[PDB]
C-alpha cells in the first residue's frame, strides 16, 4: 500500500466541514493529488501540490476545498460549506505525467440531517425445504432494513470464517419509499450452499452488516440509541433433514 487516507467515511451536516489526510508511504511517488468522484461517478482532478507549504483553494458544485501539502509525505484537504456528497481520493505517481496513477482507499462524504440516521435491522431467513427437495441446494437470505444513509457493507460468515463462494449481494440498496428524497434503505443478500451442508446442525451461518453512521464526536440529543458506526448481525444454525 502506497497511501494511507483518513477518514474513510464521514457524515457532514449541511454547511459544515471535514478534514482529510493522506500519508505517502513510499517517497518514490511524491506527486500527490486529490480527485473527487461525484454522485454521477465522474472523476475530476482537484489539486496537485508538490512542495511543502503549497496551498490552494477551489470551489465546485457541492463543496469548497482547501488543499495543503504539509510535508514531503503529508497531503491534507479541508472540505467545507458542503451541500452534496462525493468521494475523495488521494492519488500518487512517480512523475507528474506519463506514469501510473495510484488511488488511495478513498473518503466517502455524505451530506444529510444527522437526526435521520438509522442503523439497519438485520434478519436471516432459513432455506426453504422445497428448494432443498427440488434442487439439492439451500439458499439463505439476509435482509438489512430501515437504514439511512445507504453506506453498508454486508458479509457472510460460516463457522467463524468469512465466505465468498455462493454469495450474491444486491449491488445497490433499494429505497423503501422511492418517492422520498430521504427514504431509508434496504439491502438483500443470498448465500447458497449444498443442501447437505445446510442440513448439518453443527454448521453456523451469520450475516454481518457493517453500518457507517455518526461519529462519536457528533452530539446526539434524541431518545433513541445513538446511530454511530456499528455492526449489526443475524444468525442461524443448520437444520437436520
Amino acid at each position: 500500500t502506497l497511501l494511507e487516507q483518513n477518514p474513510r467515511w464521514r457524515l457532514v451536516p449541511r454547511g459544515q466541514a471535514v478534514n482529510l489526510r493522506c500519508i505517502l508511504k513510499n517517497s518514490q511517488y511524491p506527486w500527490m493529488s486529490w480527485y473527487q468522484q461525484d454522485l454521477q461517478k465522474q472523476l475530476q482532478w482537484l489539486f496537485t501540490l508538490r512542495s511543502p507549504g503549497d496551498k490552494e483553494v477551489k470551489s465546485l458544485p457541492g463543496a469548497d476545498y482547501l488543499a495543503t501539502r504539509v510535508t514531503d509525505t503529508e497531503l491534507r484537504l479541508q472540505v467545507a460549506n458542503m451541500s452534496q456528497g462525493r468521494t475523495l481520493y488521494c492519488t500518487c505517481s512517480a512523475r507528474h505525467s506519463a506514469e501510473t496513477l495510484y488511488f488511495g482507499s478513498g473518503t466517502r462524504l455524505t451530506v444529510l440531517d444527522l437526526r435521520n440516521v438509522f442503523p439497519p435491522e438485520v434478519a436471516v431467513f432459513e432455506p426453504s425445504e422445497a428448494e432443498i427437495s427440488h434442487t439439492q441446494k439451500a439458499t439463505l437470505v439476509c435482509l438489512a432494513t430501515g437504514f439511512y444513509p445507504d453506506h453498508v457493507e454486508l458479509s457472510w460468515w460460516v463457522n467463524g470464517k468469512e465466505v465468498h463462494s455462493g454469495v450474491c449481494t444486491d449491488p445497490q440498496p433499494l429505497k423503501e419509499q422511492p418517492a422520498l428524497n430521504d427514504s431509508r434503505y434496504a439491502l438483500s443478500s443470498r448465500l447458497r450452499v449444498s443442501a447437505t451442508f445446510w442440513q448439518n446442525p453443527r454448521n453456523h451461518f451469520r450475516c454481518q452488516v457493517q453500518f457507517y453512521g455518526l461519529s462519536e464526536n457528533d452530539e446526539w440529543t434524541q431518545d433513541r440509541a445513538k446511530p454511530v458506526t456499528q455492526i449489526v448481525s443475524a444468525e442461524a444454525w443448520g437444520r437436520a433433514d
Partner: protein
C-alpha cells in the same frame, strides 16, 4: 483535453466479446492513455495503458490498441466473465498537465448463461420469528426480467447473479417481502412475470 466514452452501460452475456469505446482529443504529441477498473467497494486501479501508436497492450485478457489516426483507445476482451462486472474509465495524461482527465465511465454488467433453468419461487421463514418471511425467485434464465413493485409496502429487489465455478450453482435470484398481513409471494411474483414452468410450492 477531452476523453469520451460514448456508452454509459453495456450489458453482455458471459463468454461474449467486450468492446468499450474510448476516444480522446489532445494537441500533445506526448499523450498517455489508460483504462482504469473500479470494482464495488474498491478504489479505481490501473487495467492497462499505452502511449505507443498501434501497439497491442494486454492485461488479464483485456487488451487495447492506441490508434492515433482515429484518436481511439477501445477496451476489448474476447470472452466476458462474471467477475468483469465493474465500472471502467478511460483516461488521458498529457505532459503539460498535472491532471489526468477521466471519461464519464462505462458500467459493464456481465450476465450469466443459465444452461439448465429451473425457475422457482420459494418462501423462507425468519430464523428468529416464524412470523416474518421473504420470497425468493430463483434459478430463472437471464432473459427473465424482475421489475420493481407497484405497491408501496411491497419490496422487490433487482436480479442478483451468483457467479460460481460449479455450473450447478450459477444462478439468478430476486427477493421480495412485505410487512402487510395480506401479502403472499404470488402478490410479488405473479403469473404474468414468472415463466409458465415456475416451480411454485404452497407454503
Amino acid at each position: 483535453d477531452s476523453v469520451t466514452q460514448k456508452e454509459g452501460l453495456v450489458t453482455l452475456t458471459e463468454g461474449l466479446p467486450v468492446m468499450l469505446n474510448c476516444t480522446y482529443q489532445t494537441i500533445y504529441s506526448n499523450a498517455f492513455l489508460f483504462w482504469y477498473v473500479h470494482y464495488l467497494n474498491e478504489s479505481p486501479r490501473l487495467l492497462l495503458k499505452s502511449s505507443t501508436d498501434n501497439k497491442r497492450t494486454e492485461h488479464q485478457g483485456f487488451h487495447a490498441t492506441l490508434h492515433k489516426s482515429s484518436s481511439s483507445f477501445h477496451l476489448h476482451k474476447s470472452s466476458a466473465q462474471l467477475s468483469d462486472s465493474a465500472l471502467y474509465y478511460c483516461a488521458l495524461s498529457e505532459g503539460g498537465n498535472y491532471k489526468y482527465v477521466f471519461g464519464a465511465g462505462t458500467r459493464l454488467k456481465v450476465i450469466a448463461h443459465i444452461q439448465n433453468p429451473d425457475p422457482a419461487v420459494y418462501q423462507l421463514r425468519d430464523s428468529k420469528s416464524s412470523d416474518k418471511s421473504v420470497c425468493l425467485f430463483t434459478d430463472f434464465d437471464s432473459q427473465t426480467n424482475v421489475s420493481q413493485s407497484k405497491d408501496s409496502d411491497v419490496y422487490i429487489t433487482d436480479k442478483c447473479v451468483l457467479d460460481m465455478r460449479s455450473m450447478d450453482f450459477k444462478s439468478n435470484s430476486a427477493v421480495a417481502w412485505s410487512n402487510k398481513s395480506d401479502f403472499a409471494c404470488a402478490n410479488a411474483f405473479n403469473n404474468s412475470i414468472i415463466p409458465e414452468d415456475t416451480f411454485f410450492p404452497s407454503p
